[PDB]
Amino acid sequence: FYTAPSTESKFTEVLSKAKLQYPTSTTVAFADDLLDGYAASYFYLTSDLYMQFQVAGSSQRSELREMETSGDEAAWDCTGSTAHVASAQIAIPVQEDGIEEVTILQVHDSDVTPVLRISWVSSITIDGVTSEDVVLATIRNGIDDSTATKTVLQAHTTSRTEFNINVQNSKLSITVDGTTELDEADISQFDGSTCYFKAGAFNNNPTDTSANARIKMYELEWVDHHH
């Protein structure tokens, strides 16, 4: 009884360029499945035309992963000359009790390292400063360094918010509602890696493993701009 995101033409292109992973890194729906009306409790269209992702459990996900129309996985040069841009209009509801962090957009390398996570966090402490109920950028310092540089991007609102990730040469920028919030962060530690975008709900370190993380996207796309 769930309506499919594919019923909205605004999602046709990104779904053609995606596969859906749930609840782990296994594919539940490829692009052609998504375009044929795939819908489930963890991936459906709301009555006001949001693509909603929902998932429970530690490090579980309902997430779109960038694909080429050819069916190849996206694997662009992480620090190449071609610009890669992901844009999304996201409404982050107040999260259920026991949900402590939800990753909503990523740049991921083609192995086991996220270049960038954009996530909602119940709290974070950075250089001795604690912020609560904020949206955060996390950029890993390298494949062999588990630590990351963290940047508060936005106070959490339930309002629809525009996020834009721009990746070109060895630099990554994030704009939130038109304002640059991370300006040309260095990602040269991923020289020689290949990369792809992800978007959805990725549930990080819940304190209630049966609570549902929930994230809504009004618009989503990922594109190339050739230099």
Ligand SMILES: O=C(O)[C@H]1O[C@@H](O[C@H]2[C@H](O)[C@H](O)[C@H](O[C@H]3[C@H](O)[C@H](O)[C@H](O[C@H]4[C@H](O)[C@H](O)[C@H](O[C@H]5[C@H](O)[C@H](O)[C@H](O[C@H]6[C@H](O)[C@H](O)[C@H](O[C@H]7[C@H](O)[C@H](O)[C@H](O)O[C@@H]7C(=O)O)O[C@@H]6C(=O)O)O[C@@H]5C(=O)O)O[C@@H]4C(=O)O)O[C@@H]3C(=O)O)O[C@@H]2C(=O)O)[C@@H](O)[C@@H](O)[C@@H]1O
């Ligand atoms: O400052 C402080 O507060 C403290 O910070 C502390 O340190 C922090 C860090 O700062 C940071 O916050 C860190 O965050 C971690 C997150 O919490 C979270 O755990 C995150 O999890 C990652 C995970 O590490 C992996 O990278 C994982 O990768 C998966 C991918 O997303 C993707 O789904 C992959 O899908 C592939 C499949 O796995 C298969 O390989 C599949 O195979 C296909 C082949 O391509 C082939 O074609 C074949 O033939 O067909 C198959 C097929 O189709 O099936 O391909 C797919 C594919 O699509 O590519 O799978 C990956 C996987 O292996 O699982 O993803 C998540 C993610 O980001 O999504 O990791 C974060 C991190 O480690 O950075 O947490 C730290 C912490 O908490 O400790 C401290 O420094 C502290 O001191 C500070 O105070």
